[PDB]
Design a protein around this ligand. Structure first.
Ligand SMILES: Cc1onc(-c2ccc(F)cc2)c1COc1ccc(C(=O)N2CCS(=O)(=O)CC2)cn1
Ligand SMILES: Cc1onc(-c2ccc(F)cc2)c1COc1ccc(C(=O)N2CCS(=O)(=O)CC2)cn1
Ligand SMILES: Cc1onc(-c2ccc(F)cc2)c1COc1ccc(C(=O)N2CCS(=O)(=O)CC2)cn1
Ligand SMILES: Cc1onc(-c2ccc(F)cc2)c1COc1ccc(C(=O)N2CCS(=O)(=O)CC2)cn1
Ligand SMILES: Cc1onc(-c2ccc(F)cc2)c1COc1ccc(C(=O)N2CCS(=O)(=O)CC2)cn1
Ligand SMILES: *[C@@H]1O[C@H](CO)[C@@H](O)[C@H](O)[C@H]1NC(C)=O
Ligand SMILES: *[C@@H]1O[C@H](CO)[C@@H](O)[C@H](O)[C@H]1NC(C)=O
Ligand SMILES: *[C@@H]1O[C@H](CO)[C@@H](O)[C@H](O)[C@H]1NC(C)=O
Ligand SMILES: *[C@@H]1O[C@H](CO)[C@@H](O)[C@H](O)[C@H]1NC(C)=O
Ligand SMILES: *[C@@H]1O[C@H](CO)[C@@H](O)[C@H](O)[C@H]1NC(C)=O
Lengths: 336, 336, 336, 336, 336
């Protein structure tokens, strides 16, 4: 009773050329693509790449695979995949893509009576996601995923998403978990590209990433904020304590300097200033300005002591207000 | 006398199709799985992955492999594995799995007269273990291991553990050794998942991890604890020693700042506060508060010296008690 | 209607030897090469290598592949690539080159009636780009890309660019994006090399890189500049404040020392001085010189106080002017 | 005259089944193993693994390979290795093992008239070496190397070392060179293991490693020792110099704190204290105790100056003696 | 006219056994080896390995490949390489060697009428270069490159360099470029090794490396030199400035301590002292000695001030002279 299936498979492969696409010279091959994201891999800001594991599925029609039998479907595995024609789908932005081969090559092949073919493949794509870190860390990124045929132009093979956008791309509930990003949603699109080898249709999927803040607050902002407050303590010490107030200014200035270096160690070596850089720069000004106030005060503490006390007394109020005021503008500007 | 074995193997492969599962269109294929963990690989908290080396064994029934001979069993190797049908088992959460091929592909194949087949394979799985580091380092993790068929739905292939849970999964005595985790135990479960390609049965194995503390005590807590004690020494110095007490406060505050940065370098860049972070924050408050006490004392050391001495004298007792009291609450809360 | 294509392909391969180049012993095989750079990978200054992803295309004439049919072209895939002769093109400067195999080997093969063959391949080349970091970071680099035949000398196989230089090499608009380099343009050239195995023609492509400054300004120059300004503040303090002015000089000198170490951590370990190194060295002299001025002033503050005040007063003006003057010369020299 | 060899090889493979072990169902296959260690690779303490490159040789008897000819031996290469039966030897503790394939697969095959077979293979094994770092760096490690059959139990295949232990395992004179270990010697053993798949014989080789000290002396101990001596200098300064003695105590305490952090950066993150940790802890006590002495002295320098001088004078002698005494006990205890 | 070549190749392979070396049982196979180093890869001091890319060429005589035709030579590619016998050459010291496969396997095969065969292969060898870092950084290294047959002893296969030493090994002009080494020259040698499997001839190539200094001068020596000079500035300050001179001594001592730690971070963790270590140790003595001078001076500044001034005045001259004198001896000793 099982030998019947063997006869069907042998019959289909008989007089079958896998080097020729279905409907060659008669029509245009149409491929339906659906994607399921098992896990949205880590996003490497330094390398401008993001890893992703998906179950890529393609569907098309091949009249050469029509068959008649008790079962309307023929579940199979990778063994028969190489014996038939499959699209040469590839990822344009994929810097390095590898498959999964354990325990068995993770591929599926199903065939219906009408000749419809389902080809499912598991992939891990290390794609490239260029980013504009001008509003970092209050930045939103749109990492794309482009794929299409390598050898068959639009005139021969066309890719189209199946059903609506929601069914076209699906992300696992636990897969969309990252340490420094929120997966707001996904979008799908298409576009034709003209090349020296002809026109090709491109299927594009974009993932909306909203960076989650809180790591940089504990790592960069808070040390900068508390460092500024530490400098302002010098305003409450007597002028004659030259050495004491010198330690506050010098130590704080160096502390802010190393924080800027440390902050950008993890950040990509971009040749432009970010929002965090401006915040550090302003904080650097406050600590440096406090030291200048002490130097100016200590320079005139003899000739005109009266103004020296007023400046020191006034500075106790002005500096905290300006720094507090700056934060409201800074946070409101980038959080709105 | 040895040629008889050759005839049996040749006979079994004659008229044998490896593209068809046993009992196709007649019943549901049942697979029994047993796992032995040779060594529980390192757990990468930063990458939320854990490596594991196992001897994965699958058992099923294939009536096409029945034979009669002097021996009831036919020990073999990987040579015949590709000549017969094997399940397309794969790991859903396996980010990257590779086999061992030296000296010979580490696979075993045994066949009995009744047609029962044993297929053993050695694997190294780099699975993903999402973690909730809210109670870190007093956190317990449950790293799973999910596997199942890729192409054969529940209606065709079903996986079930063999014997009891203890025999189903086994961990070597020396294998369960990690630098920062205790392998409390293992659990096994099953569940059906509905997909666009049909329903699939999933075999799940969970490993209970109890983080072992002592590295962070020597690396993070103790430096923080001793740093706080160092700051409190300033309370025992005379007020007029402005520079001396300034060094204690400034140096300690910066020391705590760098400890927080250093502590999170190894820790994953999670966007939320951990138990260790709160401990550091409280320790930061004590050192910062001590400096504020000195500044306040030095500010009123002229107008009202009487209160200045009382505050300094009182602070010698209050600060150690509060810090000691906090530790009891902190340790008891997270250790109970 | 589709079986006709099968007959053509079978006919071409009949009596076809892929071990022999077309026109062997009758003429010289001519290959036309065109390159499209999908993305100019990162440039590793430390390893003197740059990654690049290209769609390498080769065109040549093979009279053995002539055919007659309704279609003037035969789009195909990698399946037939191994069944015919292709040039043994390789990259001389490619330290490690790997192909892309997912979902299908990214190769294309097209054949015309006249026998013209188009062979397109996707590659990721980790080539070597030696650099002369004498004007770093104001340095311009010319990273080459050399390729040619491995076994067929100039007398048998010759490579020539197709059409003009612009069409010969093309770079994607978004591909030419780097964090620390600007892709000014590309150039193409040729040259014959004499070897023990014969003369070979070499096709060379050079990419002009103009390093973009701004990361080192925020990371190295500014901390050095502000550190120097910090030292000059000591000139505005009274001489009797020995400890206060000592902190400025000592802290600044050490700060500059660690900046030099930190700056070269990312920079390659080249055994010669760069422009940035000279800038740091000069900045180190200013901070060190300021400390020497204080030591000299403090040494003569008793015997001849009159000159001590003049030196301290004069130093307040001389030092800022010289440092400001140096920057104009430094920046103008390397930016012109 | 050379065609005779071709006939012999063709004859042996005729009617030969590589899926069946020699002497199947008639006796037990006996395998003789000899190992030569070309180079003992680096030992990764952090990953608890050690690399090793060996020329693994196996010898066994196969009556099916008997032949008669002018030559008593048939040197060969990897070409015939896959055409005959070879044991499925694998390394139980090998986390990742790979072969060498350049220029040609590094394998040898020799056959004698009697049917004896020699199979030599070159391997690079990244095995796991669990370590007990309780006496670190005065610790001795015993890294094992376990291998055996994967599919053939003890009842079918048995491994035994050839000749004595010295000939069984050999290490190259220059191979046994490590930066932080001495290869004292090697030992070989055997043991039977019972599994669900049957009993298997295990061949075990242990390498005795004696860690060589001198890097940690220059990196950890000496900075700690000199730091303690630096703190004791404060005892020779006058009490009224409050700021001066404060710098010694504060700087030394922080210096010891960072040394402990730095020391464990390279060391594995083990959750227990090592001998080096105790040495650092004691050194931390001395520096911290010195600061406490100054604080206590400065606290009573007014009411009872007489005792203050005695304590400071006495401390100059007590502290060096105790620290010197501790070293003798510490070094003697762990070096004996 | 091209079919003639096909007949020749088919004829040669007819009745050809690739498992047998040429001249088997009749003479000894002689192989001529020539090497061209395209680029001398980076030298990893930490891992004691150096990468190298070469075009390895082997020449030998095979009477079975004699042919008659219009052309005296048959240029070919890797396609025919596997169809004939090639030596099993391998690198004894090669820890990991991989080939280049893009665009086509980089191999060449040429055959003459007499039967002479040329086999050229491109390789990237990560060999091991043990080093004696006793004179580091004034050290000269001799990195070898050993290769020979794996299965064919000296009695069957013998390797000999072709022509003179200069032609035997060739290094590209631009290939011999390293950041911290000078490629002085190359030497070639031979030697027979006795093994359990027989005697084998070994072809050895040594590369003379002269480390180029200048990176460590800017990274280690200069900071140490300037740090010592900074300490000597304390001798020019008044004794009563206890805090001021304390900062110089304490800061300098710690600065030297961290420099030693930083210097060895890149250096391999060798368990012995290098020349740089001695230089740092001496520099550490000068800074530490200066602090001791201040402590001794401050201890006797009351009882016998006269000697205190003399010591401080004398130290201003003695210390610079000794440090300057030491450098001349140090540099002359290791540079001569
Ligand atoms: C020389 C060559 O030979 N065969 C091909 C080729 C063409 C199309 C294929 F599908 C496969 C291969 C080529 C390159 O031709 C291209 C390809 C893409 C684009 C293009 O528009 N983009 C670059 C990729 S992208 O950034 O994803 C979107 C923008 C421009 N020219
Ligand atoms: C597009 C597509 O084509 N073939 C498949 C497919 C289905 C089942 C297979 F066994 C193999 C392949 C798919 C994806 O369909 C899925 C798969 C799993 C889940 C699911 O429930 N989970 C995701 C994996 S998980 O996190 O381990 C548990 C939760 C949801 N949809
Ligand atoms: C021993 C050997 O056997 N077959 C070959 C060989 C020759 C040419 C091939 F195309 C392939 C292989 C060799 C090396 O012969 C060479 C090769 C290149 C150069 C040369 O001029 N350069 C080195 C590469 S480069 O830096 O890109 C440009 C400068 C000098 N000698
Ligand atoms: C489920 C399964 O299926 N086939 C096998 C299997 C058995 C023996 C083989 F030689 C190959 C494969 C298994 C695991 O069975 C084992 C294996 C080893 C040990 C054991 O005693 N140790 C673990 C490895 S160890 O740490 O080196 C020494 C201690 C215990 N149970
Ligand atoms: C057990 C075994 O079975 N077949 C072999 C074998 C022998 C020779 C081969 F050419 C290939 C394989 C072996 C090891 O036998 C050896 C090999 C080399 C040396 C030796 O003298 N040295 C080690 C390599 S070295 O450091 O480069 C120079 C010093 C000593 N014994
Ligand atoms: C691509 O080409 C097809 C040709 O039928 C056309 O229908 C489609 O609208 C084109 N897509 C775009 C985005 O222009
Ligand atoms: C999965 O489906 C099978 C169908 O027989 C059922 O017996 C089993 O209970 C299901 N498992 C779960 C967890 O629902
Ligand atoms: C290389 O050789 C060919 C031989 O025809 C010659 O035409 C060409 O000019 C040569 N190229 C160079 C750069 O000399
Ligand atoms: C292993 O089993 C064999 C069976 O013959 C026995 O001879 C040998 O002593 C056993 N080894 C050990 C260590 O028990
Ligand atoms: C190696 O053996 C051969 C045998 O002919 C001999 O000629 C040669 O001199 C030997 N080489 C050395 C270095 O002893």
């Amino acid at each position: 009773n099982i030998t019947i299936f063997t006869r069907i498979l042998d019959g289909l492969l008989d007089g079958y050329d896998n080097r020729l696409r279905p409907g060659l010279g008669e029509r245009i091959t149409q491929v339906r693509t659906d994607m399921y994201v098992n896990s949205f891999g880590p996003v490497s800001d330094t390398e401008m790449e993001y890893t992703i594991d998906i179950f890529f599925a393609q569907t098309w029609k091949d009249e050469r695979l029509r068959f008649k039998g008790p079962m309307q479907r023929l579940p199979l595995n990778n063994l028969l995949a190489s014996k038939i024609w499959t699209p040469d789908t590839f990822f344009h932005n994929g810097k390095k893509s590898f498959a999964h081969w354990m325990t068995t090559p993770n591929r599926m092949l199903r065939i219906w009576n009408d000749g419809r073919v389902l080809y499912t493949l598991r992939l891990t794509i290390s794609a490239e996601c260029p980013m504009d870190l001008e509003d970092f860390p209050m930045d939103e990124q749109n990492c794309p995923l482009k794929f299409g045929s390598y050898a068959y132009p639009n005139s021969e093979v066309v890719y189209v998403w199946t059903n609506g956008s929601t069914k076209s791309v699906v992300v696992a509930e636990d897969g969309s978990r990252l340490n420094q990003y929120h997966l707001m949603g996904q979008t799908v699109g298409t576009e034709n590209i003209s090349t020296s080898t002809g026109e090709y249709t491109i299927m594009t999927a974009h993932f909306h990433l909203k960076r989650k803040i809180g790591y940089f607050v504990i790592q960069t902002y808070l040390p900068c904020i508390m460092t500024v407050i530490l400098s302002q303590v010098s305003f409450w010490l007597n002028r004659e304590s030259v050495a004491a107030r010198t330690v506050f200014g010098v130590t704080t200035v160096l502390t802010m300097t190393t924080l800027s270096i440390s902050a950008r160690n993890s950040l990509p070596k971009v040749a432009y200033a970010t929002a965090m850089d401006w915040f550090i720069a302003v904080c650097y000004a406050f600590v440096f300005s406090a030291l200048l106030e002490f130097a100016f005060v200590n320079y005139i503490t003899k000739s005109q002591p009266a103004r020296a006390a007023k400046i020191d007394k006034m500075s106790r109020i002005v500096f905290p207000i300006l720094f507090g005021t700056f934060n409201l503008v800074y946070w409101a500007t980038y959080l709105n």
